[PDB]
Every structure is written in structure tokens, then in C-alpha cells.
Amino acid sequence: PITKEEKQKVIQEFARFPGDTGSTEVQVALLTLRINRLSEHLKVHKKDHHSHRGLLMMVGQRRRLLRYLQREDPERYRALIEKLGIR
Amino acid sequence: KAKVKATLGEFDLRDYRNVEVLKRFLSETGKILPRRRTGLSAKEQRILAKTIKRARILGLLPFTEKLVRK
Amino acid sequence: KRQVASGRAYIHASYNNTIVTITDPDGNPITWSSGGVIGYKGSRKGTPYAAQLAALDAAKKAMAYGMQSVDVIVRGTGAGREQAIRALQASGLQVKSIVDDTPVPHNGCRPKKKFR
Amino acid sequence: MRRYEVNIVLNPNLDQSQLALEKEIIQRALENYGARVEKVEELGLRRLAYPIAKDPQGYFLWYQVEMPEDRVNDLARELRIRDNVRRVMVVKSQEPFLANA
RNA sequence: GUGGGAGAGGGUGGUGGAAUUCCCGGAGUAGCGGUGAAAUGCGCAGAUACCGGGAGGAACGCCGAUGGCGAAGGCAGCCACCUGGUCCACCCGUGACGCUGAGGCGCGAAAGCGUGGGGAGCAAACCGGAUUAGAUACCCGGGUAGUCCACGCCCUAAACGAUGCGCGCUAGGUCUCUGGGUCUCCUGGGGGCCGAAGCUAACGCGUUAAGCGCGCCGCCUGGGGAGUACGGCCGCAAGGC
Ligand SMILES: [Mg+2]
Ligand SMILES: [Mg+2]
Ligand SMILES: [Mg+2]
Ligand SMILES: [Mg+2]
Ligand SMILES: [Mg+2]
Ligand SMILES: [Mg+2]
Ligand SMILES: [Mg+2]
Ligand SMILES: [Mg+2]
Ligand SMILES: [Mg+2]
Ligand SMILES: [Mg+2]
Ligand SMILES: [Mg+2]
Ligand SMILES: [Mg+2]
Ligand SMILES: [Mg+2]
Ligand SMILES: [Mg+2]
Ligand SMILES: [Mg+2]
Ligand SMILES: [Mg+2]
Ligand SMILES: [Mg+2]
Ligand SMILES: [Mg+2]
Ligand SMILES: [Mg+2]
Ligand SMILES: [Mg+2]
Ligand SMILES: [Mg+2]
Ligand SMILES: [Mg+2]
Ligand SMILES: [Mg+2]
Ligand SMILES: [Mg+2]
Ligand SMILES: [Mg+2]
Ligand SMILES: [Mg+2]
Ligand SMILES: [Mg+2]
Ligand SMILES: [Mg+2]
Ligand SMILES: [Mg+2]
Ligand SMILES: [Mg+2]
Ligand SMILES: [Mg+2]
Ligand SMILES: [Mg+2]
Ligand SMILES: [Mg+2]
Ligand SMILES: [Mg+2]
Ligand SMILES: [Mg+2]
Ligand SMILES: [Mg+2]
Ligand SMILES: [Mg+2]
Ligand SMILES: [Mg+2]
Ligand SMILES: [Mg+2]
Ligand SMILES: [Mg+2]
Ligand SMILES: [Mg+2]
């Protein structure tokens, strides 16, 4: 799955301040996680197309938020890519 | 000859193991019963299905029976 | 030669024919008959009448085997499926239970073009 | 872990040696598979609706457990190996949805 | 983000019963099958109908719907695992991060191709039987590919709502699936029917627009010749754009 505090540890690690649930950095991290799970799932089960869709889509969102970081504050975007292993 | 919910108490709809209630949902033959006659709701009936099927696969419920008189 | 005296009677009723098998209380067949068992040849075989003569034949046969009290099993549908149970009651055998067993599949075999 | 119900029907014609052996073996399954037992119901002789292994009847068990996600499928394989065991049906627990409530 | 929900959305292993074919056995005789009527066919090497046991493949009665899910193709026994989408409530976090989308890439019913399995039922081609003026046709009896699996091609359709995606805005009524609520009812979110205004050549559409508006993509320009020819690209081929 992705259990609850499985996810928590990620939101804690990634928030800009205490209490931030929805920032960009967080949104992207949650994305990366979910992505990664999915990509592992489809290493096996390559015959599962309907999920793969969700992966394209997943990826797409993540990238649109990324382009928004680079646009708005190239610094925090370096930051985020560093922590994440992306792009 | 009104419906089967109409005569019964609180009973788990998810209890696959409870035959005494479940039998009371099937035909004279084995056939799981229509909504018109079990008087459930969509969600109700839909659950009663999966439970019954479960119990059948477990041997305590009929897949089909023989039709009497005729 | 067994003197069986109680037992099973089956009506297998087709659209084309009706066959009636008499059998003993564990299921091994005493006698039988059909529409072509009696004279009837073609289509004529699946009439109700023929179903009736079949019933009667097999009954007369089993009554000579010793039969009386007989529980009935119907399989099939078609002319004189019913008329064979009607001639079975009329036999002078006591019809004890009447039971419809017609096999239906829980849907696995494709049928003949004829049939879908 | 997760909340499951293990269902076991076995051969009704069992005596002691036999049956409490199948049961030590079942216990040893659950032990070996990371499976904690919450509660257990042994209902025994019951009249099945249809013959299972030529038998007009069956011997019933209900074991509610908590065990790993990954292993449950393997659990029920090594449980079905038993000759004497006629059916294993495993389920995830669901709360009790009511009716006519 | 948290907390809830419904579902035949997908992938993977497992497993359950009904039925058909077959084999083994018991008992039992003279037919069964089939049609408008027939015949071909099977049956005395014992069929059919019946009881019991086994093997194998395929598909999942009732539930089942005028139901649900999915972007589409499509998806129906049960179980478990791995997953995608989505809905509501709270109004908590970001702070315009949006829509569309040439090309590209991926999916894509059935049939078809490659290699290797599998093969019960069905069944193009085919072999026979009757009908009939006549048969290749409709009806009958056989039957191979194929149907099924794995992996790799193929890329088409009445792939249809013959209705491109997003957003705002314009009476209601009734039926329904699924959330929430202080639950005669209100309030989301889907599926239907009828109907304001309006549109429309009509038919019809009508808060699931075919109405009123904006954005963006696709496409059309008399019927034939023709989805042909040539050319390119893809394709193992069939053939496709
Ligand atoms: Mg006939
Ligand atoms: Mg949630
Ligand atoms: Mg599904
Ligand atoms: Mg699935
Ligand atoms: Mg011959
Ligand atoms: Mg048999
Ligand atoms: Mg074989
Ligand atoms: Mg139906
Ligand atoms: Mg469709
Ligand atoms: Mg899910
Ligand atoms: Mg706010
Ligand atoms: Mg602020
Ligand atoms: Mg600004
Ligand atoms: Mg273009
Ligand atoms: Mg494109
Ligand atoms: Mg195909
Ligand atoms: Mg070919
Ligand atoms: Mg092939
Ligand atoms: Mg092959
Ligand atoms: Mg044919
Ligand atoms: Mg011919
Ligand atoms: Mg003619
Ligand atoms: Mg055939
Ligand atoms: Mg295709
Ligand atoms: Mg259509
Ligand atoms: Mg337009
Ligand atoms: Mg409610
Ligand atoms: Mg409501
Ligand atoms: Mg509505
Ligand atoms: Mg409405
Ligand atoms: Mg209307
Ligand atoms: Mg008008
Ligand atoms: Mg009009
Ligand atoms: Mg609109
Ligand atoms: Mg022209
Ligand atoms: Mg022209
Ligand atoms: Mg040219
Ligand atoms: Mg060319
Ligand atoms: Mg070439
Ligand atoms: Mg072509
Ligand atoms: Mg073409």
C-alpha cells in the first residue's frame, strides 16, 4: 500500500514549516513516492496497462509542479531535485 | 407473501457462516432470490450475494436443488 | 426376474422424442421404452400420445417385473413430457413423488448455432 | 499485519489421534507463517448442502487471526496440502454490516 | 492534507460448483438422433435413457438490473495479494501552479500472422445428407484452422451517443446508483425519462444541450472515378496510414 505514517514520515521530512501539509515541495515528494511504488509494480506485471495510465498522469502532475518551482524559485527547485533524485 | 427482510431481526448480512438466516434467502431450488422477493436494497442484495456465494463455496449452502411436484 | 416392487421412473422428454426408463431404488434400470420403441418412426415419435404409450409400455413392463410404488424424475421439456407423467399416474403404479431434475449448466459450454 | 478469518473443513470421520494431529499441524502452520491467533471457533460436525469428497458431511473450524499481508496466500497453500483437509477458505475481516436495523 | 465510501477499473497466483465431451464400471434392449417431412450418422464389438468413479478443456446459471467501473477498447463464480481511477465531508496546507494540444510516445474489439503449448464444446475451409428447376446457399450429420494460454507482431470497425476536451451561464418534474446532512426532505456526485426558455430542415436536443458564451485541437467543401492509382512510411505477411 502506502500506510499512514509511512506517508507521514515523508510529509514531515518535506514540509517547509511545521503544519504544512500541502506545499509544493511536499506535493512533489508524495508524488515521487507514489510514482516509485507504481514503477516498481509495473517492473513485474508489465501486462497491467490500466495502471500504467495512472503513471503517465502521475508523472505529468509531478512535472508540472516541478516546472512551477523552477519558474518561481530556482533555488528551492535545486533543493527539491537534490533531496529527491529527479531530473 | 411479503418479503424476507420483513420477517427478521438485526442479522449480519456479511455472515457467511450463518446458514439459518441465509437459507431463508434462496428458492425452493438453489437459486439466490430476486430483489422483488428478498426486499433488500441494492447494496443490501449485492452483499447478500457475495456472502451466499462464499458460504456455498464453503459447503453449508446449496448450489442448486431439485424441484418438487411439477 | 428380481421382483423389485418399488422404485425410480425417469421421463427424459426431448422435442423430438420422449424416453421413459424404469429403475430400482438405488438407480439400476429395470426396463425402458420410447416413441420408436413402439411403432412410431419420425416426428411422430415426439408426440404427447407417443409419450403416453411409452409411459404405459415401460410401466406394463415393470409391473410384470413386480413394481408398484414409484417416485418420478423428469428431465427435459416438450410435447408430452407432461403427458408421460399423466400416463404414469394412470398406469396403476402409485406415483409417489414427482420431481423435476432438468440439468441446466451454470454456463460453460458454447452451444450449436441452432441454440443461441 | 491484517485481520483475517481462516476457514477449515476437514474429514468428519476423524477420531482423536488423527484430528488433534491435523490440529497441531494447523497450529504449526499459523505459528510458522507469522500468524497470531485472535480467537477460535471449532463447530465440528455439520450437514453439508452437497457431498464434498463423497462425504454427506463435514468438520468445521474458524480461526480469526492477524498476520502479514505478503504471506497469507502461502499460508493457505501449505494448509491445503493436507489430505484430510477438504476446504480452506481464507478471508479478510469486515465489520458487521447490519440489515433490517 | 485528513477522514470516510461505492465499483464486473487493471495484473498476478489460488480455488469452487453446474453442464458437455471422453474413458472405466454397474444394470438394461433395440433403438437413438435428427426434420417441414427426411436422409446421411451412431447402435448387437450392446448405443440411447440410468446409477457410480475418473480425466480434460472452456465458460461462470440465480443474483442481474431500465445497475456498476473504466479514457477508450472493454470488464461478471469465489479468495488472496499487487495496483489505477474516482466521490463526499472538514475548509486545514500551496498560492494561478491553469485549459487545449500539431508532432511524438502508449493503449487499442474481433479476425489475422510468428514460435511454442493446449484442445472439451463450437466451427470459415472442407466431406457427406435432404430441399429444390438447380447447390457451392438457407435445414441435417461430420470436421480443420481458429477459438483457449504464453511471448512477439498486426492498428482495423456501425472503435456509435454516427455527438472532440475544458469552463461559466439559462425553469421544473419523475425514476434510479452512490456519498453527506439537523433524514416529509434537503445537499453533492453518476445513470435514465419527460419538459421552461432557446435551438433545429425536420426528426428531434433541452443543467448528461443539439441552448447562451470563451479557449484550443480535429475535420468538411456536388455524386461518381476511389479509399482507387502513384509516391513515401510502417508491416514477416495479410495489409495499414
Ligand atoms: Mg424425432
Ligand atoms: Mg482519502
Ligand atoms: Mg474487477
Ligand atoms: Mg481483476
Ligand atoms: Mg450402421
Ligand atoms: Mg457419468
Ligand atoms: Mg484428453
Ligand atoms: Mg437474467
Ligand atoms: Mg461499447
Ligand atoms: Mg483502490
Ligand atoms: Mg485555506
Ligand atoms: Mg497565505
Ligand atoms: Mg503572481
Ligand atoms: Mg495535424
Ligand atoms: Mg496526439
Ligand atoms: Mg484475438
Ligand atoms: Mg492464414
Ligand atoms: Mg497462432
Ligand atoms: Mg499453434
Ligand atoms: Mg455444420
Ligand atoms: Mg452441403
Ligand atoms: Mg430453392
Ligand atoms: Mg457438430
Ligand atoms: Mg487488435
Ligand atoms: Mg451504439
Ligand atoms: Mg465545436
Ligand atoms: Mg441516507
Ligand atoms: Mg441523495
Ligand atoms: Mg441528477
Ligand atoms: Mg434529472
Ligand atoms: Mg425530451
Ligand atoms: Mg418546430
Ligand atoms: Mg415535434
Ligand atoms: Mg456544456
Ligand atoms: Mg468529388
Ligand atoms: Mg467530382
Ligand atoms: Mg504521386
Ligand atoms: Mg503503396
Ligand atoms: Mg519493407
Ligand atoms: Mg483489407
Ligand atoms: Mg483500408
Q: Are C98 and C72 in contact (CB under 8 A)?
A: yes
Q: Using the CA of D53, which nucleotide's C1' is the nearest one?
A: E53
- Exposure b/e, B45-64, CB count within 10 A at least 16 = b: bebbeebbebbbebbbbbeb
Strand E contact residues in chain C (70-89), C-beta within 7 Å: 75
Q: How far is C109 from D76, CA to CA, in rounded Å? A: 31
Phi-psi region of B45 (alpha: psi -120 to 50; beta: other; left: phi over 0): alpha
Using a 7 Å CB cutoff, list residues 14-43 of B near strand E: 26-27, 29-35, 41-43
Lookup: cell for B42: 441494492
Alpha carbons A23 and C19: distance in angstroms, whole number: 80
- Which amino acid, residue D89? M
Range of the domain at C79: 1-116
**Is D49 near strand E, with its CB below 7 A from some atom of it?**
no
Cell 518551482 locates to A69
The DSSP letter of residue A17 is: S
In whole angstroms, E20 C1' to B17 CA is: 33
Domains and CATH numbers, chain D: 1-101 (3.30.70.60)
- Structural domain total, chain C: 1
Coil, strand or helix: which one is C14? coil
Closest CA to B32 of B54, B8, B1: B54
Q: What separation, in Å, do the N-terminal and C-terminal C-alpha atoms of chain C show?
A: 47
Using alpha carbons, select from D57, D49, D67, D59 the residue that is nearest to residue D5: D67
Q: Which of D3, D22, D13, D6 is nearest to D83 (CA)?
A: D22
The experimental method behind these coordinates is X-ray
Q: What share of chain B is helix, strand, coil (3-state, %, to 5)?
A: 40, 5, 55
Count Cβ atoms below 10 Å from residue C83 Cβ, excluding itself.
Answer: 21
Neighbour-count burial of A9, counting CB atoms closer than 10 A to its CB (0-12 exposed, 13-18 middle, 19+ buried): exposed
CB atoms within 10 A of CB A14: 21
**B40 touches B22 (CB < 8 A):** no
Q: Does B14 touch chain D (CB under 8 A)?
A: yes
Cα–Cα distances in angstroms (integers) from residue C41 to residues A26, C47, C76, C114, in the given order: 85, 11, 20, 23
- Classify domain B1-70 at the CATH topology level: 30s Ribosomal Protein S18 (4.10.640)
At residue A50, the 3 state secondary structure works out as: helix
What radius of gyration do chain A's Cα atoms show? Answer: 14
* Secondary structure class of D6 (helix, strand, coil): strand
Domain CATH number, residue C57: 3.30.420.80
Distance CA C60, CA D33 (A): 67
Domain that holds residue A42: 1-87
**Domain ranges (residues) in chain B:** 1-70
Cell of C55: 409411459
**Strand segments (E) across C45-103:** 69-76, 94-100
- How close is the nearest chain C Cα to the Cα of B65, in Å? 9
The domain total for chain A is 1
D52: CB partners within 8 A, 6+ apart: B59, D9, D58, D86, D87
B48 CB and strand E closer than 7 A: yes
Question: What resolution, expressed in A, was reported for this entry?
Answer: 3.7
Amino acid residing at C14 = S
In this structure, what are the phi and psi dihedrals at residue C27, rounded to the nearest 5 degrees?
105, -5
Please give the angle made by the CA atoms of D46, D48 and D51, to the nearest 5 degrees.
130
Residue B6 falls in which region: left (phi positive, over 0), alpha (psi -120 to 50) or beta: alpha
Burial of C11 (0-12, 13-18, 19+ CB in 10 A): buried
How distant, in Å, are the alpha carbons of A10, A58, A78, D45 from that of A41?
Answer: 20, 14, 28, 44
Do C19 and C38 touch, CB atoms closer than 8 A? no
Among left, alpha and beta (phi > 0; psi -120 to 50; other), residue A14 is alpha
Q: Hey, are the CB atoms on C99 and B63 less than 8 Å from each other?
A: no
All chains having 3 or more CB pairs closer than 8 angstroms to chain D = B
Strand E atom within 7 Å of A47 CB? yes
Which residues, at least 6 apart from A79, have a Cβ–Cβ distance to it below 8 Å?
A25
Q: Which three cell numbers stand for residue C29?
A: 434400470
Does A43 contact strand E, using a CB cutoff of 7 Å? no
The amino acid at B11 = F
D58: helix, strand or coil? strand
Greatest C-alpha distance within chain B: 36
